[PDB]
């Protein structure tokens, strides 16, 4: 049923009716050459260079678009099909600008390609060609546009992938520019994907203006850790420093699209970066010395000091692998103060079940869901490439988007319920207007943001939004698999330190001072020297000078995920590999190695001593770590609400807000995107 | 160990480097067991990892004494590969500089077999011969010799706007010349006898050990690949080939000598008779884009970048073209993926057969016999070391 | 386009099913490819019992042996690809036969029926490592003395694992893991689009 | 499972072929050091052809053992013919290279990847 | 008449690789990803095995990158997962294979943007 | 002192070289020179640069001189071009 047979040349392949004819080449395997055709993007029919021709029919059809009927077959390497090609790359080449040595998408391009295989060995156009004005379109994207074909994938994605509707087509004729009528920037997060999405090289990446050409550039496969949707990202390096960080395509995570922030920050990530181990001298100054020095500078402390002596505030970006070789010592020395700087409510069952923490609905799971019920957090600009979820999804599909929080730019129509926590509890009892709106939902989506849970209150908000998923779940009677209750991070390595069993918050460390702090790649100000014990004897393990490193006796310097093959997990569990593109710099070393190595100095060695042994050591402490790509189906969420229904917490009236609350804001979080000199020139832009 | 001894490396005697060991009781030789290698560079498994056109300067390299007619072979493979064939005039070149690298290659064979001999002035008259067509590949390549003149589409540039009427000058006096060493060699005294009955090679035996070249030829078998299985437009002009009789090393040289001699009536008739027109494929999809064209034509620079940058994109196949190398068959077994880079490449090279038999000829003979023995093989070592 | 000449496609094309006929035992597959070049392809057993009837039958006298290769697809469970070139100096005329060995399962040598193969067959053992059963003297031509490993594999580094240089110390050369101060740049060239099949 | 083999049917009689290969370098190792004017030990020496005859002990299949025989009698040949100067056999001791330590401090103190 | 091993077929030992690089060097068998950059997928097609990416220094005198690591290039391609596998198996080295994504079915029509409902 | 000013500084272990050797670096540097060409005035909207002497120049583009605002600048020969 719903299998029409279709032959794409006599190959009989079925397809469900309403797949376009290029679409049934696809399944047999052919390629129909295609521009302004993008599987994400709406169908627009504006290069035809797909003119396909269905078997005795009088005309050329568009791939792209032709529905394909009941028996028709395509034709795909016939004599007129190949006409139909080399005259319209006659014309897409007829008014180019030739500087394909210019055009940094130079082996990268999609137009001499087609030209290359499917187009014409000479040309006629023995008439001139045309040029448009070159217009900033901002700091990131380097508008050559002399060179558009006029796909208009850009206006596009400019408006169904990401909200921005900004770009648009201007004038008619051969002088028809598709560039910003008056001279606004295309600020937004996702505005980065153009430059990838438009196969012509018109614009492309200022930053990566020209600093290396394809071929060259060897790619490796790895995970995006500046932001907790740990999109897919695949990093291409050239003799050693990385040159791009461009997307790979994860259907679940990041479906071909990374955000603004982590593929401009790779330049934040060659300076101000630490390398050499160095210690406090007697003088007061930070000294380059050599490793066995700085690690007994260390060891010698922590033999002396007990337990509850030594502390770690760990956060950021640090690898699971790091994080247990970090527990596993301070335990050998009896401290279970390992704690991170996002504070995540662990008053009821928290870190214990696995769905308290998490994002159990899927990434995938906002594509099926009805109602979602954002609840203080800015998605945009915490979690970008699972806001573009919930904005696909209120396209395509009919989600009705609920934020109580400010009321704030979403990409979309939401409903701003208000800007207080206690009115959550006024959908608990039924009394707001939208407590039908999901009684009506069969499928509904509660989404509690980290940074609310990062208040005074956040105990009660976790608990108050508890009780209303309850009494949702129950009013909608929604099946189990289905899971309301999801809550999203906005640091890479906090699900997998809450999963290794690191308590989170400092709030331990706050009433009982240690006499050392190993700070983890820590470069918040969660506890400062001023806070801690006179001793204040604290050592900085991690990969940039930001704010932990002048206030550290000693100096270990780390790597940075570029230059490690450590595991991130994101907010729905799914454990993932980042892969080593480029070896860790100066003396700086794997981040797991500093501890075990620290541990052998100081004598409690840990077990492991290859990575392959670390990831045996992750496998005993929690499942997720071992098994990558692997989202974990089942959760416990009716014993947390029990938990919950015995805390009694108070949610303070002030209302919640994301620290977010525009996107400069965003550009510069964390310590790779602090020292981003493109994120510099892009705050300063906004600013 | 019967007094073994390696012939060594180091020797005027041995071309390049040979070591031979072996065992003699005095004078007498009753083993020789060569050994290889000693240029061994990789020129096979290199190419898997260059492109079809960055690849081609490596079979200059393969045996450089002939340094084009090896490009030739690359060249047929690639292009029967593709299916394409080159312009006219492009055949006419690759003939015509394909048989002037074939005097080339017998100037250097029968000199340098001379001097290991001991006879040393014929080297000096025929060197400045060779000097004067050097002159000739440097006027149409730019390099005396490693040209990479002949590519796999045609040749890369028209010839220089007067290289033909010198080509004839040469030719019209080359004879002479020839005729000089004649005087000195082919009747002396001396020459004959240490030459004459030594290293015969029977017809049967010639085609068991794959010798494929004067060497058979030498021994009577009547084989030119140029005439059995045309390639180029070697079919279009006539020339007699040498066969030769009572095959040993002054047999087999009378025919290195008569080829020398038939060369010389080949390139006349390619200075008579070349066509005008292009020498190189239109096909931008496998010949680069004329300098012109890419600087005014997008889509010839887009071909001109994808072919310098990429490459010519092969389709799937293998192939094994032999062509008649001054030494002998020289063929190119090309396996290809689609890709722009080829997968394997051996190189069948006249030579690593003929030393094969230089155990099976070199039997019951003095030192002085080996001696003249590898040079009757002309071996070079890039070609049987590759 | 090349002169293609069908007379040939043909008579080559027939004598492919000839040999396939009176060997039906070893011949797996037969083919006569568009650059108009005829492969027979046989099972290893049949090295010997392939050859020896195109060497010696008046139908088909293949004499010469152009040449003995071992392309190696590694993906084929069977990594060698051995590729024998025949040359009929009479018939005039050039057949392949190509066989598979993996790399501990040796072919039969045929320096019997043709003895130019005696080192091309050392060539294929020093560069793949396919052992010859019954060669008269098997051992490395091209590869250095004391060389580990077999280079033409895919599966080896271009530059390898060992360089020489001469240490005073030792006043002798010396073997140690190569250090390259310029790695071979790896370019990536093969493009994303690909040719609709003729 | 179901392979031809390549000379001994079985690992027994394989190892029987090894017994004769280690004889034969045992005789040979003496012989070396003085045709090659080598500065070894002959006793050295003997210990560096145990040492290869077991660096590849671990080997349980007959047809791997058998082809290492046949490379090692190759090895033989060349070693007991000249064929390989000093300097070809001196490379077995690694006398040149500095050796380097297995212990992870060690690694770690050294390289960035080990 | 053939013999019985159960061994699997493990040849590290006629390969000729040092030890370090047979027990150090983990592969990764992997179907590449796309540029994005590129729409073409002809280079998402045969699955490849790459090894361990290792140091690559600036050189002193030229600055040009250099690296000790002999099997860095080398990057052999498979046309099948279970192929790939047995390479790893039979020279030693260990694999940790990643499954083939690819791009799930979407549904498009032209007519269904032209939808002022939706 | 050279074109990108490549110093290798007092404190470096490579500045050893030049010791009794001179350094190569660039008089006239081309980062001025072009900057020190005149712009070339012209009618048209759109104007060609090919280089200057077409096959021996560089591939030929057309410039869009069409705000005085901006010169338009070939790519290829930084030589500003003024409407
Ligand atoms: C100083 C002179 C230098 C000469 C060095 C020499 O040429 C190089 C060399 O020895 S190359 C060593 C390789 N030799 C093998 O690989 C034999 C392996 N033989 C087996 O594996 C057996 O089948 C068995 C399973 C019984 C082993 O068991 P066992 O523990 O020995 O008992
Ligand atoms: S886009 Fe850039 S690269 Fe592709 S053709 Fe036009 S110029 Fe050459
Ligand atoms: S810019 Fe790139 S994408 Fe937007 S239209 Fe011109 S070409 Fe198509
Ligand atoms: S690809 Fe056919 S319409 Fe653009
Ligand atoms: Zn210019």
Same mark, same amino acid.
């Given at each position: 049923?719903?299998?029409?047979?279709?032959?794409?040349?006599?190959?009989?392949?079925?397809?469900?009716?309403?797949?376009?004819?290029?679409?049934?080449?696809?399944?047999?395997?052919?390629?129909?050459?295609?521009?302004?055709?993008?599987?994400?993007? !709406?169908?627009?029919?504006?290069?035809?260079?797909?003119?396909?021709?269905?078997?005795?029919?009088?005309?050329?059809?568009?791939?792209?678009?032709?529905?394909?009927?009941?028996?028709?077959?395509?034709?795909?390497?016939?004599?007129?099909?190949?006409?139909?090609?080399?005259?319209?790359?006659?014309?897409?080449?007829?008014?180019?600008?030739?500087?394909?040595?210019?055009?940094?998408?130079?082996?990268?391009?999609?137009?001499?390609?087609?030209?290359?295989?499917?187009?014409?060995?000479?040309?006629?156009?023995?008439?001139?060609?045309?040029?448009?004005?070159?217009?900033?379109?901002?700091?990131?994207?380097?508008?050559?546009?002399?060179?558009?074909?006029?796909?208009?994938?850009?206006?596009?994605?400019?408006?169904?992938?990401?909200?921005?509707?900004?770009?648009?087509?201007?004038?008619?004729?051969?002088?028809?520019?598709?560039?910003?009528?008056?001279?606004?920037?295309?600020?937004?997060?996702?505005?980065?994907?153009?430059?990838?999405?438009?196969?012509?090289?018109?614009?492309?990446?200022?930053?990566?203006?020209?600093?290396?050409?394809?071929?060259?550039?060897?790619?490796?496969?790895?995970?995006?850790?500046?932001?907790?949707?740990?999109?897919?990202?695949?990093?291409?390096?050239?003799?050693?420093?990385?040159?791009?960080?461009?997307?790979?395509?994860?259907?679940?995570?990041?479906?071909?699209?990374?955000?603004?922030?982590?593929?401009?920050?790779?330049?934040?990530?060659?300076?101000?970066?630490?390398?050499?181990?160095?210690?406090?001298?007697?003088?007061?100054?930070?000294?380059?010395?050599?490793?066995?020095?700085?690690?007994?500078?260390?060891?010698?402390?922590?033999?002396?000091?007990?337990?509850?002596?030594?502390?770690?505030?760990?956060?950021?970006?640090?690898?699971?692998?790091?994080?247990?070789?970090?527990?596993?010592?301070?335990?050998?020395?009896?401290?279970?103060?390992?704690?991170?700087?996002?504070?995540? &409510?662990?008053?009821?069952?928290?870190?214990?079940?696995?769905?308290?923490?998490?994002?159990?609905?899927?990434?995938?799971?906002?594509?099926?869901?009805?109602?979602?019920?954002?609840?203080?957090?800015? &998605?945009?600009?915490?979690?970008?490439?699972?806001?573009?979820?919930?904005?696909?999804?209120?396209?395509?599909?009919?989600?009705?988007?609920?934020?109580?929080?400010?009321?704030?730019?979403?990409?979309?129509?939401?409903?701003?319920?208000?800007? !207080?926590?206690?009115?959550?509890?006024?959908?608990?009892?039924?009394?707001?207007?939208?407590?039908?709106?999901?009684?009506?939902?069969?499928?509904?989506?509660?989404?509690?943001?980290?940074?609310?849970?990062?208040?005074?209150?956040?105990?009660?908000?976790?608990?108050?939004?508890?009780?209303?998923?309850?009494?949702?779940?129950?009013?909608?009677?929604?099946?189990?698999?289905?899971?309301?209750?999801?809550?999203?991070?906005?640091?890479?390595?906090?699900?997998?330190?809450?999963?290794?069993?690191?308590? &989170?918050?400092?709030?331990?460390?706050?009433?009982?001072?240690?006499?050392?702090?190993?700070?983890?790649?820590?470069?918040?100000?969660?506890?400062?020297?001023?806070?801690?014990?006179?001793?204040?004897?604290?050592?900085?393990?991690?990969?940039?000078?930001?704010?932990?490193?002048?206030?550290?006796?000693?100096?270990?310097?780390?790597?940075?995920?570029?230059?490690?093959?450590?595991?991130?997990?994101?907010?729905?569990?799914?454990?993932?590999?980042?892969?080593?593109?480029?070896?860790?710099?100066?003396?700086?070393?794997?981040?797991?190695?500093?501890?075990?190595?620290?541990?052998?100095?100081?004598?409690?060695?840990?077990?492991?001593?290859?990575?392959?042994?670390?990831?045996?050591?992750?496998?005993?402490?929690?499942?997720?770590?071992?098994?990558?790509?692997?989202?974990?189906?089942?959760?416990?969420?009716?014993?947390?609400?029990?938990?919950?229904?015995?805390?009694?917490?108070?949610?303070?009236?002030?209302?919640?807000? &994301?620290?977010?609350?525009?996107?400069?804001?965003?550009?510069?979080?964390?310590?790779?995107?602090?020292?981003?000199?493109?994120?510099?020139?892009?705050?300063?832009?906004?600013? | 160990?019967?007094?073994?001894?390696?012939?060594?490396?180091?020797?005027?005697?041995?071309?390049?480097?040979?070591?031979?060991?072996?065992?003699?009781?005095?004078?007498?030789?009753?083993?020789?067991?060569?050994?290889?290698?000693?240029?061994?560079?990789?020129?096979?498994?290199?190419?898997?990892?260059?492109?079809?056109?960055?690849?081609?300067?490596?079979?200059?390299?393969?045996?450089?004494?002939?340094?084009?007619?090896?490009?030739?072979?690359?060249?047929?493979? *690639?292009?029967?590969?593709?299916?394409?064939?080159?312009?006219?005039?492009?055949?006419?070149?690759?003939?015509?500089?394909?048989?002037?690298?074939?005097?080339?290659?017998?100037?250097?064979?029968?000199?340098?077999?001379?001097?290991?001999?001991?006879?040393?002035?014929?080297?000096?008259?025929?060197?400045?011969?060779?000097?004067?067509?050097?002159?000739?590949?440097?006027?149409?390549?730019?390099?005396?010799?490693?040209?990479?003149?002949?590519?796999?589409?045609?040749?890369?540039?028209?010839?220089?706007?007067?290289?033909?009427?010198?080509?004839?000058?040469?030719?019209?006096?080359?004879?002479?010349?020839?005729?000089?060493?004649?005087?000195?060699?082919?009747?002396?005294?001396?020459?004959?006898?240490?030459?004459?009955?030594?290293?015969?090679?029977?017809?049967?035996?010639?085609?068991?050990?794959?010798?494929?070249?004067?060497?058979?030829?030498?021994?009577?078998?009547?084989?030119?690949?140029?005439?059995?299985?045309?390639?180029?437009?070697?079919?279009?002009?006539?020339?007699?080939?040498?066969?030769?009789?009572?095959?040993?090393?002054?047999?087999?040289?009378?025919?290195?000598?008569?080829?020398?001699?038939?060369?010389?009536?080949?390139?006349?008739?390619?200075?008579?008779?070349?066509?005008?027109?292009?020498?190189?494929?239109?096909?931008?999809?496998?010949?680069?884009?004329?300098?012109?064209?890419?600087?005014?034509?997008?889509?010839?620079?887009?071909?001109?970048?994808?072919?310098?940058?990429?490459?010519?994109?092969?389709?799937?196949?293998?192939?094994?073209?032999?062509?008649?190398?001054?030494?002998?068959?020289?063929?190119?077994?090309?396996?290809?993926?689609?890709?722009?880079?080829?997968?394997?490449?051996?190189?069948?090279?006249?030579?690593?057969?003929?030393?094969?038999?230089?155990?099976?000829?070199?039997?019951?003979?003095?030192?002085?016999?080996?001696?003249?023995?590898?040079?009757?093989?002309?071996? *070079?070592?890039?070609?049987?070391?590759? | 386009?090349?002169?293609?000449?069908?007379?040939?496609?043909?008579?080559?094309?027939?004598?492919?099913?000839?040999?396939?006929?009176?060997?039906?035992?070893?011949?797996?597959?037969?083919?006569?490819?568009?650059?108009?070049?005829?492969?027979?392809?046989?099972?290893?057993?049949?090295?010997?019992?392939?050859?020896?009837?195109?060497?010696?039958?008046?139908?088909?006298?293949?004499?010469?042996?152009?040449?003995?290769?071992?392309?190696?697809?590694?993906?084929?469970?069977?990594?060698?690809?051995?590729?024998?070139?025949?040359?009929?100096?009479?018939?005039?005329?050039?057949?392949?036969?190509?066989?598979?060995?993996?790399?501990?399962?040796?072919?039969?040598?045929?320096?019997?029926?043709?003895?130019?193969?005696?080192?091309?067959?050392?060539?294929?053992?020093?560069?793949?490592?396919?052992?010859?059963?019954?060669?008269?003297?098997?051992?490395?031509?091209?590869?250095?003395?004391?060389?580990?490993?077999?280079?033409?594999?895919?599966?080896?580094?271009?530059?390898?694992?060992?360089?020489?240089?001469?240490?005073?110390?030792?006043?002798?050369?010396?073997?140690?893991?190569?250090?390259?101060?310029?790695?071979?740049?790896?370019?990536?060239?093969?493009?994303?689009?690909?040719?609709?099949?003729? | 499972?179901?392979?031809?083999?390549?000379?001994?049917?079985?690992?027994?009689?394989?190892?029987?072929?090894?017994?004769?290969?280690?004889?034969?370098?045992?005789?040979?190792?003496?012989?070396?050091?003085?045709?090659?004017?080598?500065?070894?030990?002959?006793?050295?020496?003997?210990?560096?052809?145990?040492?290869?005859?077991?660096?590849?002990?671990?080997?349980?299949?007959?047809?791997?053992?058998?082809?290492?025989?046949?490379?090692?009698?190759?090895?033989?040949?060349?070693?007991?013919?000249?064929?390989?100067?000093?300097?070809?056999?001196?490379?077995?001791?690694?006398?040149?290279?500095?050796?380097?330590?297995?212990?992870?401090?060690?690694?770690?103190?050294?390289?960035?990847?080990? | 008449?053939?013999?019985?091993?159960?061994?699997?077929?493990?040849?590290?030992?006629?390969?000729?690789?040092?030890?370090?690089?047979?027990?150090?060097?983990?592969?990764?068998?992997?179907?590449?990803?796309?540029?994005?950059?590129?729409?073409?997928?002809?280079?998402?097609?045969?699955?490849?095995?790459?090894?361990?990416?290792?140091?690559?220094?600036?050189?002193?005198?030229?600055?040009?990158?250099?690296?000790?690591?002999?099997?860095?290039?080398?990057?052999?391609?498979?046309?099948?997962?279970?192929?790939?596998?047995?390479?790893?198996?039979?020279?030693?080295?260990?694999?940790?294979?990643?499954?083939?994504?690819?791009?799930?079915?979407?549904?498009?029509?032209?007519?269904?943007?032209?939808?002022?409902?939706? | 002192?050279?074109?990108?000013?490549?110093?290798?500084?007092?404190?470096?272990?490579?500045?050893?070289?030049?010791?009794?050797?001179?350094?190569?670096?660039?008089?006239?540097?081309?980062?001025?020179?072009?900057?020190?060409?005149?712009?070339?005035?012209?009618?048209?909207?759109?104007?060609?640069?090919?280089?200057?002497?077409?096959?021996?120049?560089?591939?030929?583009?057309?410039?869009?001189?069409?705000?005085?605002?901006?010169?338009?600048?070939?790519?290829?020969?930084?030589?500003?071009?003024?409407?």
């Amino acid at each position: 049923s719903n299998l029409i047979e279709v032959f794409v040349d006599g190959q009989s392949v079925m397809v469900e009716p309403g797949t376009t004819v290029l679409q049934a080449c696809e399944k047999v395997g052919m390629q129909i050459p295609r521009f302004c055709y993008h599987e994400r993007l !709406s169908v627009a029919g504006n290069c035809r260079m797909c003119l396909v021709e269905i078997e005795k029919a009088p005309k050329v059809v568009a791939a792209c678009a032709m529905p394909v009927m009941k028996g028709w077959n395509i034709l795909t390497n016939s004599e007129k099909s190949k006409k139909a090609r080399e005259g319209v790359m006659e014309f897409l080449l007829a008014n180019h600008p030739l500087d394909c040595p210019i055009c940094d998408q130079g082996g990268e391009c999609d137009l001499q390609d087609q030209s290359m295989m499917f187009g014409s060995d000479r040309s006629r156009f023995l008439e001139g060609k045309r040029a448009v004005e070159d217009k900033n379109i901002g700091p990131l994207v380097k508008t050559i546009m002399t060179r558009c074909i006029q796909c208009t994938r850009c206006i596009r994605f400019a408006s169904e992938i990401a909200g921005v509707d900004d770009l648009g087509t201007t004038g008619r004729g051969n002088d028809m520019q598709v560039g910003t009528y008056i001279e606004k920037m295309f600020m937004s997060e996702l505005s980065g994907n153009v430059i990838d999405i438009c196969p012509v090289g018109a614009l492309t990446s200022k930053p990566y203006a020209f600093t290396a050409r394809p071929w060259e550039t060897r790619k490796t496969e790895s995970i995006d850790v500046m932001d907790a949707v740990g999109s897919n990202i695949v990093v291409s390096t050239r003799t050693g420093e990385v040159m791009r960080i461009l997307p790979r395509m994860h259907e679940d995570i990041n479906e071909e699209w990374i955000s603004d922030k982590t593929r401009f920050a790779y330049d934040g990530l060659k300076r101000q970066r630490l390398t050499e181990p160095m210690v406090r001298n007697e003088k007061g100054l930070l000294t380059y010395t050599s490793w066995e020095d700085a690690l007994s500078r260390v060891a010698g402390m922590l033999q002396n000091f007990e337990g509850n002596a030594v502390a770690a505030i760990a956060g950021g970006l640090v690898d699971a692998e790091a994080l247990v070789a970090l527990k596993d010592l301070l335990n050998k020395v009896d401290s279970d103060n390992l704690c991170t700087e996002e504070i995540f &409510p662990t008053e009821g069952a928290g870190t214990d079940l696995r769905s308290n923490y998490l994002l159990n609905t899927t990434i995938a799971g906002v594509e099926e869901a009805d109602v979602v019920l954002l609840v203080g957090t800015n &998605p945009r600009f915490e979690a970008p490439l699972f806001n573009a979820r919930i904005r696909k999804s209120w396209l395509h599909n009919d989600l009705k988007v609920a934020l109580i929080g400010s009321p704030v730019d979403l990409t979309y129509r939401y409903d701003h319920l208000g800007d !207080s926590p206690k009115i959550l509890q006024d959908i608990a009892s039924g009394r707001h207007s939208f407590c039908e709106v999901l009684k009506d939902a069969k499928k509904p989506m509660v989404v509690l943001g980290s940074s609310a849970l990062q208040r005074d209150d956040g105990a009660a908000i976790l608990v108050a939004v508890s009780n209303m998923v309850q009494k949702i779940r129950v009013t909608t009677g929604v099946a189990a698999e289905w899971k309301v209750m999801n809550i999203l991070h906005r640091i890479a390595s906090q699900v997998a330190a809450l999963d290794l069993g690191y308590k &989170p918050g400092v709030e331990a460390i706050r009433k009982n001072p240690p006499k050392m702090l190993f700070l983890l790649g820590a470069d918040g100000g969660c506890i400062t020297r001023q806070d801690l014990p006179k001793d204040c004897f604290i050592v900085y393990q991690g990969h940039h000078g930001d704010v932990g490193a002048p206030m550290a006796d000693v100096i270990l310097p780390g790597a940075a995920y570029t230059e490690k093959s450590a595991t991130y997990v994101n907010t729905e569990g799914r454990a993932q590999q980042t892969k080593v593109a480029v070896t860790p710099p100066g003396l700086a070393r794997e981040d797991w190695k500093i501890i075990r190595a620290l541990s052998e100095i100081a004598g409690i060695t840990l077990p492991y001593d290859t990575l392959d042994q670390v990831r045996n050591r992750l496998e005993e402490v929690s499942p997720n770590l071992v098994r990558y790509d692997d989202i974990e189906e089942t959760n416990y969420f009716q014993q947390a609400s029990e938990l919950a229904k015995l805390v009694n917490q108070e949610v303070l009236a002030d209302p919640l807000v &994301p620290p977010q609350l525009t996107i400069k804001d965003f550009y510069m979080t964390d310590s790779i995107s602090r020292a981003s000199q493109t994120m510099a020139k892009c705050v300063k832009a906004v600013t | 160990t019967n007094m073994t001894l390696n012939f060594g490396p180091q020797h005027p005697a041995a071309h390049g480097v040979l070591r031979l060991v072996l065992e003699l009781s005095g004078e007498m030789v009753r083993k020789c067991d060569p050994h290889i290698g000693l240029l061994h560079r990789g020129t096979e498994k290199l190419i898997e990892y260059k492109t079809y056109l960055q690849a081609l300067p490596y079979f200059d390299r393969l045996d450089y004494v002939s340094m084009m007619c090896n490009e030739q072979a690359y060249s047929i493979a *690639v292009e029967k590969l593709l299916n394409i064939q080159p312009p006219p005039r492009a055949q006419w070149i690759r003939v015509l500089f394909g048989e002037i690298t074939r005097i080339l290659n017998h100037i250097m064979a029968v000199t340098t077999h001379a001097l290991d001999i001991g006879a040393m002035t014929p080297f000096f008259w025929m060197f400045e011969e060779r000097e004067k067509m050097f002159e000739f590949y440097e006027r149409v390549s730019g390099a005396r010799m490693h040209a990479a003149y002949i590519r796999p589409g045609g040749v890369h540039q028209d010839l220089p706007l007067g290289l033909l009427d010198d080509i004839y000058e040469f030719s019209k006096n080359f004879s002479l010349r020839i005729d000089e060493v004649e005087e000195m060699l082919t009747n002396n005294r001396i020459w004959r006898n240490r030459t004459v009955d030594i290293g015969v090679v029977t017809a049967e035996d010639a085609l068991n050990y794959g010798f494929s070249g004067v060497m058979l030829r030498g021994s009577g078998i009547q084989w030119d690949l140029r005439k059995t299985q045309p390639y180029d437009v070697y079919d279009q002009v006539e020339f007699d080939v040498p066969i030769g009789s009572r095959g040993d090393c002054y047999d087999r040289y009378l025919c290195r000598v008569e080829e020398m001699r038939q060369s010389l009536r080949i390139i006349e008739q390619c200075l008579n008779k070349m066509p005008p027109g292009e020498i190189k494929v239109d096909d931008a999809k496998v010949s680069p884009p004329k300098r012109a064209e890419m600087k005014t034509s997008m889509e010839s620079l887009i071909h001109h970048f994808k072919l310098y940058t990429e490459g010519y994109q092969v389709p799937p196949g293998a192939t094994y073209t032999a062509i008649e190398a001054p030494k002998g068959e020289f063929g190119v077994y090309l396996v290809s993926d689609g890709s722009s880079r080829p997968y394997r490449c051996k190189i069948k090279a006249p030579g690593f057969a003929h030393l094969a038999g230089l155990d099976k000829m070199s039997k019951g003979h003095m030192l002085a016999d080996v001696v003249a023995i590898i040079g009757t093989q002309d071996i *070079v070592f890039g070609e049987i070391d590759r | 386009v090349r002169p293609r000449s069908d007379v040939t496609h043909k008579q080559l094309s027939a004598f492919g099913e000839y040999v396939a006929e009176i060997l039906p035992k070893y011949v797996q597959q037969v083919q006569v490819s568009c650059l108009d070049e005829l492969e027979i392809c046989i099972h290893p057993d049949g090295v010997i019992p392939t050859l020896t009837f195109l060497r010696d039958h008046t139908n088909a006298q293949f004499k010469s042996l152009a040449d003995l290769t071992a392309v190696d697809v590694p993906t084929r469970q069977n990594r060698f690809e051995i590729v024998y070139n025949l040359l009929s100096l009479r018939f005039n005329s050039r057949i392949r036969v190509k066989t598979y060995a993996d790399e501990l399962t040796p072919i039969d040598s045929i320096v019997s029926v043709h003895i130019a193969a005696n080192w091309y067959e050392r060539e294929v053992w020093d560069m793949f490592g396919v052992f010859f059963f019954n060669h008269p003297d098997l051992r490395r031509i091209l590869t250095d003395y004391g060389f580990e490993g077999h280079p033409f594999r895919k599966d080896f580094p271009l530059t390898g694992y060992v360089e020489l240089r001469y240490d005073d110390e030792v006043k002798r050369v010396v073997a140690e893991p190569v250090e390259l101060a310029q790695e071979f740049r790896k370019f990536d060239l093969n493009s994303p689009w690909e040719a609709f099949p003729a | 499972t179901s392979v031809k083999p390549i000379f001994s049917r079985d690992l027994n009689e394989a190892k029987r072929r090894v017994r004769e290969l280690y004889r034969a370098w045992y005789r040979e190792v003496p012989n070396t050091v003085h045709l090659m004017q080598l500065d070894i030990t002959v006793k050295q020496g003997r210990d560096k052809v145990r040492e290869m005859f077991m660096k590849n002990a671990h080997v349980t299949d007959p047809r791997v053992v058998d082809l290492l025989v046949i490379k090692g009698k190759m090895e033989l040949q060349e070693t007991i013919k000249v064929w390989k100067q000093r300097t070809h056999v001196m490379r077995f001791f690694h006398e040149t290279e500095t050796p380097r330590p297995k212990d992870f401090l060690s690694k770690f103190y050294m390289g960035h990847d080990p | 008449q053939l013999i019985t091993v159960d061994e699997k077929l493990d040849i590290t030992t006629l390969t000729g690789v040092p030890e370090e690089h047979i027990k150090t060097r983990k592969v990764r068998i992997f179907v590449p990803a796309r540029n994005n950059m590129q729409s073409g997928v002809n280079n998402t097609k045969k699955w490849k095995m790459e090894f361990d990416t290792r140091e690559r220094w600036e050189n002193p005198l030229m600055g040009w990158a250099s690296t000790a690591d002999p099997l860095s290039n080398m990057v052999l391609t498979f046309s099948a997962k279970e192929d790939a596998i047995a390479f790893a198996e039979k020279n030693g080295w260990s694999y940790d294979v990643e499954e083939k994504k690819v791009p799930k079915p979407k549904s498009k029509s032209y007519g269904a943007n032209f939808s002022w409902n939706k | 002192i050279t074109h990108t000013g490549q110093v290798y500084d007092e404190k470096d272990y490579r500045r050893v070289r030049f010791v009794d050797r001179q350094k190569e670096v660039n008089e006239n540097f081309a980062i001025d020179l072009i900057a020190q060409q005149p712009v070339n005035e012209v009618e048209h909207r759109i104007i060609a640069c090919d280089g200057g002497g077409g096959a021996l120049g560089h591939p030929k583009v057309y410039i869009n001189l069409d705000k005085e605002t901006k010169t338009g600048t070939c790519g290829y020969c930084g030589l500003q071009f003024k409407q």
